[PDB]
Design an enzyme around this catalytic site. Structure first.
Site, PDB file in Angstrom:
ATOM      1  CD  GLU A   1      -6.592  -2.139  -3.005  1.00  0.00           C
ATOM      2  OE1 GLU A   1      -6.603  -2.254  -4.264  1.00  0.00           O
ATOM      3  OE2 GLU A   1      -6.210  -1.111  -2.424  1.00  0.00           O
TER       4      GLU A   1
ATOM      5  CD  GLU B   1      -3.625  -2.015  -3.819  1.00  0.00           C
ATOM      6  OE1 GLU B   1      -3.859  -1.233  -4.766  1.00  0.00           O
ATOM      7  OE2 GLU B   1      -3.757  -1.733  -2.592  1.00  0.00           O
TER       8      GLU B   1
ATOM      9  CG  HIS C   1      -6.112   0.481   2.027  1.00  0.00           C
ATOM     10  ND1 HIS C   1      -6.119   0.063   0.713  1.00  0.00           N
ATOM     11  CD2 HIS C   1      -7.378   0.854   2.317  1.00  0.00           C
ATOM     12  CE1 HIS C   1      -7.337   0.214   0.220  1.00  0.00           C
ATOM     13  NE2 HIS C   1      -8.123   0.671   1.178  1.00  0.00           N
TER      14      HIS C   1
ATOM     15  CG  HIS D   1      -8.741   0.420  -5.168  1.00  0.00           C
ATOM     16  ND1 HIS D   1      -7.731   0.685  -4.270  1.00  0.00           N
ATOM     17  CD2 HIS D   1      -9.772   1.222  -4.829  1.00  0.00           C
ATOM     18  CE1 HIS D   1      -8.129   1.628  -3.436  1.00  0.00           C
ATOM     19  NE2 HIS D   1      -9.365   1.968  -3.751  1.00  0.00           N
TER      20      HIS D   1
ATOM     21  CD  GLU E   1      -4.365   1.771  -2.916  1.00  0.00           C
ATOM     22  OE1 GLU E   1      -4.533   1.022  -1.949  1.00  0.00           O
ATOM     23  OE2 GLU E   1      -4.722   1.479  -4.072  1.00  0.00           O
TER      24      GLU E   1
ATOM     25  CE1 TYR F   1      -3.226  -4.193   6.028  1.00  0.00           C
ATOM     26  CE2 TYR F   1      -1.944  -2.603   4.821  1.00  0.00           C
ATOM     27  CZ  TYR F   1      -2.881  -3.595   4.842  1.00  0.00           C
ATOM     28  OH  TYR F   1      -3.459  -3.979   3.651  1.00  0.00           O
TER      29      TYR F   1
ATOM     30  CG  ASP G   1      -2.200  -0.830   0.928  1.00  0.00           C
ATOM     31  OD1 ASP G   1      -2.876  -0.521  -0.062  1.00  0.00           O
ATOM     32  OD2 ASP G   1      -2.490  -1.811   1.649  1.00  0.00           O
TER      33      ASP G   1
HETATM   34 MN   LIG Z   1      -5.748  -0.337  -4.300  1.00  0.00          MN
HETATM   35 MN   LIG Z   2      -4.721  -0.752  -0.859  1.00  0.00          MN
END
Ligand SMILES: [Mn+2]
Ligand SMILES: [Mn+2]
Ligand SMILES: [Mn+2]
Ligand SMILES: [Mn+2]
Lengths: 288, 285
Positions: free
Chosen positions: A195, A161, A96, A198, A93, A100, A62
């Site tokens: 995703e 992805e 994302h 995406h 992104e 984490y 990401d």
């Molecule tokens: Mn993506």
């Molecule tokens: Mn992503």
């Protein structure tokens, strides 16, 4: 010089994807993860290490999609409405990637988190994976690019992805499907929901670019796409062996990788290349 | 290859700006514009034309910021947390740009809207303005850029949205400060709220790069920055005369341009170079 005009459609899909991406907008503070501590401690050391390593790899992917992939593709797009969608996707992104870190803050000490990111930065296969993908993006660092170059960067983006990542989403889903780390699993499902669209959107753009190419250029990128697919597959099999041998899941993860490779190919308008198996039923319960 | 690690600060401000950018998130459908019709029809033809032209220009600016300026600056940043903030800012530039179409849909017919965007595309001053700015961004389309090149792209970005398009926010704010087109004024205020913190953030990054430059390179970009400031100012003066002479606001808009040029300089850590209209100030409330 043209300004984007949303009262005149540039294509039949960008508005729908704009609305859908905005509708799905979320941030990491929406999901509290502290309750995952109770099942985290039920895992073994080897299971915890695998989890942290795969999330480290997802963060790298990401980081590169938000920081190189989406920006360099969108800069060279002529459709201003599609450009708008890609810019929003690029921002997500970064959401994302940050999510984490939100998981890590709950599950690991500061020292352990430093260990993860150091391992990510020095890992030979992750460097090889990421390097192959980002080389396609780096070719766009010039004032004028060919459509072949832009097409292949779009392919790389879809493969990253819709396909390469899933060696990594497997384990959070597998654990969530067994009732473990389910709050972190909720975050991973929000990421996957993004995703999914995406990959569909970039695949549509790629198919549009492909149709614009000469027959010679089409033959070239058709072959390069299949080679890239299988080059990355070989690397991902080596990565799965390294990450998952300790916990006995190598063949399961490989099946999931092939499943999602077929999905990425279909996003590009291409036929599946791996035998059509069902999704692992535990993973499927984690997607619920 | 490095992944972004938000559990270890890369600087003292990126998290602060990430959170604030997120907290300010909004979309075009949050503000209904229909009620503006009642004050729209009370404007003269000349006032409506000026309104549509300024909003067309604002759309061009955001189209360029989201599609060129933010992506090319961020791709060359080393700081991954700052990169993240810029990616979100770039997305918001597309929200800004789309929100002007939301206003147009209420205030103009389909044919009138296509006239606006045709006028924008072929306008010589707007082409010159955007061309100067985006030439600094186009310099970043290569694998290795110098810190001077990255600095000047950041300067151009600060000038674009702290300075060079306040010739445009003037009129929506001026009308809103009189109770006219106040719902569109609410949208413009949301945009300005974002751009305030965009300019501050890019200005911080610019100052950080500046401090890494050699003394000779610092001298060179200081000269280029001051010359760019005044090259744009000359073009803006011509633009304001073209847009506002019909409605008698040229000198007022020129004062507003100078005020915001000073703010852009301050965002870059530079001293002001020029020596707010109270109705505009009421439109900002
Ligand atoms: Mn993506
Ligand atoms: Mn992503
Ligand atoms: Mn903007
Ligand atoms: Mn901005």
């Amino acid at each position: 010089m043209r300004a984007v005009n949303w009262n005149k459609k540039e294509d039949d899909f960008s508005l729908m994807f704009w609305k859908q991406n905005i509708a799905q907008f979320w941030t990491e503070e929406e999901i509290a993860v502290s309750s995952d501590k109770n099942t985290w401690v039920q895992l073994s050391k080897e299971e915890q290490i695998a989890y942290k390593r795969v999330l480290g790899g997802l963060t790298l992917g990401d980081t590169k999609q938000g920081g190189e992939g989406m920006p360099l593709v969108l800069v060279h797009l002529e459709n201003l409405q599609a450009k708008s969608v890609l810019a929003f996707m690029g921002a997500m992104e970064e959401v994302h990637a940050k999510s984490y870190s939100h998981i890590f803050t709950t599950l690991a000490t500061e020292e352990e988190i430093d260990e993860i990111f150091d391992w990510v930065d020095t890992h030979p296969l992750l460097e090889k994976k990421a390097g192959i993908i980002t080389s396609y993006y780096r070719r766009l660092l010039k004032p004028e690019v060919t459509k072949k170059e832009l097409y292949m960067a779009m392919v790389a983006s879809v493969f990253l992805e819709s396909y390469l990542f899933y060696s990594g989403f497997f384990y959070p889903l597998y654990l969530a499907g067994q009732g473990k780390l389910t709050a972190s699993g909720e975050i991973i499902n929000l990421i996957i929901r993004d995703e999914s669209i995406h990959g569909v959107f970039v695949g549509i753009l790629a198919q549009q670019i492909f149709a614009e190419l000469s027959a010679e250029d089409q033959q070239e990128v058709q072959k390069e796409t299949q080679e890239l697919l299988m080059e990355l597959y070989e690397i991902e099999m080596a990565y799965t062996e390294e990450i998952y041998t300790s916990i006995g899941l190598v063949e399961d993860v490989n099946r999931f990788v092939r499943y999602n490779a077929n999905k990425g190919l279909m996003n590009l308008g291409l036929e599946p290349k791996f035998e059509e198996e069902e999704i692992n039923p535990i993973v499927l319960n984690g997607l619920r």
